[PDB]
Subunit: 233 residues, 4 copies
Amino acid sequence: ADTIVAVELDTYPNTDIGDPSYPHIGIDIKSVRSKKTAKWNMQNGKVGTAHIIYNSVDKRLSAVVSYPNADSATVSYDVDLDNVLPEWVRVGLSASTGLYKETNTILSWSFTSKLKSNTNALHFMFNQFSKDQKDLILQGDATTGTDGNLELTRVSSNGSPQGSSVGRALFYAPVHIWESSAVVASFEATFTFLIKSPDSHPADGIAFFISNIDSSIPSGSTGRLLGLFPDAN
Amino acid sequence: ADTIVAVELDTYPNTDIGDPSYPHIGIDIKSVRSKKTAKWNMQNGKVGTAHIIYNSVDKRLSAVVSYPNADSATVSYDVDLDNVLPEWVRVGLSASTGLYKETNTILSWSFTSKLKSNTNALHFMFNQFSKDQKDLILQGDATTGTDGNLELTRVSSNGSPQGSSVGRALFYAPVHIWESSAVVASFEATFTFLIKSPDSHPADGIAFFISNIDSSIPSGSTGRLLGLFPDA
Amino acid sequence: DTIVAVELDTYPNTDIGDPSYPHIGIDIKSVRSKKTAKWNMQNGKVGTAHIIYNSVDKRLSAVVSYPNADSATVSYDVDLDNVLPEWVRVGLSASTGLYKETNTILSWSFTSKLKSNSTHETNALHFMFNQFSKDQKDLILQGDATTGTDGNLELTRVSSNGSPQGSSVGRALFYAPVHIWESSAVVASFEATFTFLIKSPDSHPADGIAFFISNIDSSIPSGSTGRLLGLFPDAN
Amino acid sequence: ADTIVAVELDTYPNTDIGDPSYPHIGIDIKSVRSKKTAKWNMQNGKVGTAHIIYNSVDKRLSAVVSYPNADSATVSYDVDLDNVLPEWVRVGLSASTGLYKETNTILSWSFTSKLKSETNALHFMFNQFSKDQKDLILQGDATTGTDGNLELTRVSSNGSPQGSSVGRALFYAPVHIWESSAVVASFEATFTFLIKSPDSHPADGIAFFISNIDSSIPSGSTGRLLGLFPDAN
Ligand SMILES: CO[C@H]1O[C@H](CO)[C@@H](O)[C@H](O)[C@@H]1O
Ligand SMILES: CO[C@H]1O[C@H](CO)[C@@H](O)[C@H](O)[C@@H]1O
Ligand SMILES: CO[C@H]1O[C@H](CO)[C@@H](O)[C@H](O)[C@@H]1O
Ligand SMILES: CO[C@H]1O[C@H](CO)[C@@H](O)[C@H](O)[C@@H]1O
Ligand SMILES: [Ca+2]
Ligand SMILES: [Ca+2]
Ligand SMILES: [Ca+2]
Ligand SMILES: [Ca+2]
Ligand SMILES: [Mn+2]
Ligand SMILES: [Mn+2]
Ligand SMILES: [Mn+2]
Ligand SMILES: [Mn+2]
């Protein structure tokens, strides 16, 4: 299937498939059963920030999720992505709903990859998303243009979120994420999100992910699979 | 056909289609008959640099082509690209040969687009090109493994350039080059080239170009059309 | 010494060559702008200033926009090789006089690049400020200029009640000298961006904000409050 | 005295003050006795590259020193620089000679600091150094030339390096290296060097360092102290 490396912002505890008992941030390598998580004090209706980083020296994937004037949640996992991802990848944001629902609004998204050989660089930054955003591949229920925002999960005209939704946005350009004859390689992602819900239960979450170039939404990956994974193994 | 805005580095004077009597740099808007040129003191076998720039305020497309420790050649043309290019474009390098040949080697290529609305940004930079460069669309005789270099025109194993060759590389991502509800829009391209020839006559040149997304090499655009244009 | 500036002039001083309306202007070695443009200044709304110049076009351009309003633009063709010293400092100035306004800077970005003729490589400086701390050690504050109040740079005196004060001058310069041009340069570009909030109780707000490039050792000239925007000694 | 955090490129083994028996790269925190080293295959007369990085998430200072077409040497040390450096610092390159001599030529120097609270950022990049480089504070025998290079140690008119030399260049601007109300803070330094010597013994090395703003060359910091430290404690 697809090869997926992802940082999950999991809003629904699915303790059946190895989630903790609370909303968490987690690093998923080839599986939705995170290789490390951390308690996340998710704030319904407030605009949060995700910072993802990795470099070829430390070989450690790290993430930080803050709200302004609250303590950040952090998670790190040591992983050689040379042994996990293909040389050439695409980068994306995924989200999902199931029985429970939430808005999965992305307000901004930045990414930077650098690769000094034995530098090549890509950088994109989105603070506005247009009705036809030709440098984005939208999959599933994903839309651009409403208030200049990327809405990853289905939302009605009245701004009310929908259940059993999966949706992704991938940067159109392939990315050279690692090279054999490389001395240093870094990448860095940043996105802002707004997750609103009517219910005491919001579900199911947003992820930043790196996949094989041709990656598509796996079948029935709505809900607890965050549109990333086919099964819950 | 394709909509083409380009900065030509023309090494062969084709005075029949409006070239000056000397190697020149020129700004082509929807035509190979440049809207302004400037004398270019092209150096066979030396590594040169091209800088292209434009912004929504000045609305002026400018180019500089230098060799280290030589006087630069410059050309500018005032053009509102809102009235010329589509909102969404691709960026690329083209080159060509005809009766006469040159190596059209690209050693580096950088591009930056910015767009502050009523900022979004793209940046790529290439100093090495790999055997399979998946963020480049190579058209025509264009190759990337070489020696870390983009070779836009056919070159044999002994490093000798070939005649009647056309070849392009476009950045895979579409680029948002202008917007109606924009306050400022900038772009900037930079490439290094090495143009070598055995002959006194090298031909026919390299261009940086911005086109419609689906742009392909027009038919028999070898030689004086630099792989950009169908006719003159 | 030498001032090159983009003025955001909120008070028409028609005696020293201002138009009859609030304007944006390019001042070279004088407060009598070399070109202006009508500016529809919005009291209490957050605007944006974009300044740009390059060694090829040799044209200094500015855009001042308010969200969902027309941009005002001004350009002037000038070779800054013949005007500024090789090495400069960059800054924001503001002032008040009879009429007053808040001269609040909420963000300030600057980028200089300088690709050389000898070598292939570029020299570059970049700073970006979105927050300003109580002690901002990479800023030289002159006059009534302060940092820390809501993480903003307040260029003119503002009392405890948040009410702006008259007869105030104040500047902030980036601590590092900037190499703005070189003889053996092929291209040289610079770009400044700042957000401002200009609020006033009066129908008359005064007197304005400028981005400026000066000699390194530049200080607030004597009685440059009011119409001289803390940039110029006399109104010549 | 001065507070010094540095990445040493040590070319002379001073085993009496805790150097390994070979040329090494090391991470020095408030002392010339490195907190971690690594064997460095120093190449006399070839142009090398130093890459330093650190971030507030991992809190790990990492360095890589390569030559073209040779294996890089790497060193990392986990350190919270919040507990070590002052909030505001200056950045610099130091070098030295003693009994033995080497050219300590810097051909390029780049630095980038970021600080998300919007983000504050500084970036400078030098590929050419002018006769009067007004954004650099040169201390000791440090010069900038019409060869376009920063020469940290005394070099005669014969292109021949001199003994008992100390010399530093600090970026003129203070740098905000950390903040209490920060979510992420990163920095990254890169410099190219050429270290040439007539002898089999070259000495004594180059460092990238972060210090207190008002930092000056300590007394008798020639030779094995690399112009960084007063004593060898
Ligand atoms: C009871 O679990 C269901 O609802 C949750 C909440 O959305 C989903 O995560 C999950 O996939 C199921 O559809
Ligand atoms: C005789 O002219 C031919 O050869 C030159 C040299 O390339 C081309 O420019 C031109 O288009 C023709 O093909
Ligand atoms: C009547 O003019 C006075 O007030 C205006 C308003 O600021 C100033 O510009 C000027 O210097 C004078 O002090
Ligand atoms: C005996 O060692 C001396 O020479 C070496 C070589 O430079 C220096 O490192 C050291 O400080 C002393 O001056
Ligand atoms: Ca879950
Ligand atoms: Ca021609
Ligand atoms: Ca005035
Ligand atoms: Ca030593
Ligand atoms: Mn989970
Ligand atoms: Mn021509
Ligand atoms: Mn005026
Ligand atoms: Mn040592």
